[PDB]
Design a binder for this molecule. Structure first.
Ligand SMILES: CCn1c(CO)nn(-c2nc(O[C@@H](C)C(F)(F)F)c(C(=O)Nc3c(C)ccnc3Cl)cc2F)c1=O
Ligand SMILES: Cc1cc2nc3c(=O)[nH]c(=O)nc-3n(C[C@H](O)[C@H](O)[C@H](O)COP(=O)(O)O)c2cc1C
Ligand SMILES: O=C(O)c1cc(=O)[nH]c(=O)[nH]1
Length: 359
């Protein structure tokens, strides 16, 4: 095909060449700019009905989303839908603008198909993002109605005494513009503090007018203890949290990393994260009895990777790191491969496969 043509050219030639000419953060900035300008192939993969998922109070035309981190400040949303993502998550957005950590803060491990980042929540801040989303609010309303929802990942400022108030500020400012909101949780009086935090976030969400009321999801790292996971599952069910995003990057360094930069501080993403992420999905699905929708993320670069997470319990998947190695054709690739595998494994669509390993 012409589709498999582009896939090969980008993966084997263009992306390696560009990544060899640009530092990783410059590559990221340029990518955002090109995406924001729509400088991308036309719609090659027309989405099958098999790929449609209904979850979180919304239609998702396909289950493959762009993970938080790529478009931190909501600059490239429209270009991301043009790239073929079924949904877009922006952020993390912090209340006040902040610069994040000193550069260099992004590192490529090409031998491992992995990245390490320590951006440190560099953010244009809620006000700038709010006005940016307001400018395209009705365009987004039609996109969401057509099965292309928008998520917003909310962060906190580095120097914040009150994490809960930062997240609450985010709910009030960007919740009215979002189909779902995300708050990242780290290691949990720990369970009680999580309950307190999430109660405050949900209260603020419930205070928004009904038409402008987003789903709230909790995003977890893969580095939590069993007890942490057990406590998160319990609190999520108790409070009626709408969903889980599983997982963020890992602070672990799995045996076998080859990249020269493997010992850089930060979160590791891509292929070495894949199976850690999948097994975290499997655990969270079981601990929530399959009642809490999961967005599966970490090392998805193929239809097989996507389907493994779906069968483990994910309703939707996200990727980012695969895009840094494969470029934009990876989205069409993942979707085509997923459709083919669904047919091969006897599923009528994505919905039927969700949690199939647990049955
Ligand atoms: C983790 C930081 N990080 C890194 C490094 O670790 N890379 N990276 C990406 N870089 C990209 O391309 C660059 C090489 C450049 F300079 F070409 F913009 C793209 C991308 O999709 N580019 C792109 C577009 C948008 C349209 C048409 N053609 C092409 Cl190649 C996607 C990425 F996630 C990125 O976010
Ligand atoms: C450069 C970079 C920046 C990221 N920034 C964020 C962020 O701001 N908020 C967040 O929740 N996750 C962030 N992530 C985590 C991704 O959303 C995703 O959970 C993780 O990278 C695993 O998926 P992947 O292996 O497909 O990249 C970031 C990841 C990378 C690589
Ligand atoms: O901004 C970052 O450093 C960042 C945030 C996050 O949630 N995950 C990540 O890997 N990096």
């Amino acid at each position: 095909a012409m589709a498999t043509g582009d896939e090969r050219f980008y993966a084997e030639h263009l992306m390696p060449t560009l990544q060899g000419l640009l530092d990783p953060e410059s590559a990221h900035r340029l990518a955002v700019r090109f995406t924001s300008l729509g400088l991308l192939p036309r719609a090659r993969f027309q989405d099958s009905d098999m790929l449609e998922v209904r979850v979180l109070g919304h239609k998702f035309r396909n289950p493959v989303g762009i993970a938080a981190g790529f478009d931190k400040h909501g600059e490239a949303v429209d270009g991301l839908y043009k790239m073929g993502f079924g949904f877009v998550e922006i952020g993390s957005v912090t209340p006040k603008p902040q610069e994040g950590n000193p550069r260099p803060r992004v590192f490529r491990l090409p031998e491992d198909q992995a990245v390490i980042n320590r951006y440190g929540f560099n953010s244009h801040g809620l006000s700038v993002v709010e006005h940016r989303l307001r400018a395209r609010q009705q365009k987004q309303a039609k996109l969401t109605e057509d099965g292309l929802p928008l998520g917003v990942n909310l962060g906190k400022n580095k120097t914040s005494v009150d994490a809960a108030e930062d997240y609450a500020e985010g709910v009030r400012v960007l919740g009215p513009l979002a189909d779902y909101l995300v708050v990242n949780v780290s290691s949990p009086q720990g369970k009680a503090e999580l309950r307190r935090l999430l109660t405050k976030v949900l209260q603020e969400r419930d205070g928004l007018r009904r038409v402008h009321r987003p789903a709230v999801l909790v995003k977890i790292a893969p580095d939590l203890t069993s007890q942490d996971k057990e406590d998160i599952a319990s609190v999520v069910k108790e409070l009626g949290i709408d969903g889980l995003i599983v997982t963020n990057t890992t602070v672990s360094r799995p045996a076998g990393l080859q990249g020269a930069l493997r010992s850089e501080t930060g979160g590791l993403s891509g292929k070495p994260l894949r199976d850690l992420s999948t097994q975290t999905i499997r655990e969270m699905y079981a601990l929530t009895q399959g009642r809490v929708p999961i967005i599966g993320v970490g090392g998805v670069s193929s239809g097989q990777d996507a389907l493994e997470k779906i069968r483990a319990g994910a309703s939707l998947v996200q990727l980012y790191t695969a895009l840094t190695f494969w470029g934009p054709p990876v989205v069409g690739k993942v979707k085509r491969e997923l459709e083919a595998l669904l047919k091969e494994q006897g599923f009528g669509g994505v919905t039927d496969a969700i949690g199939a390993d647990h049955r």
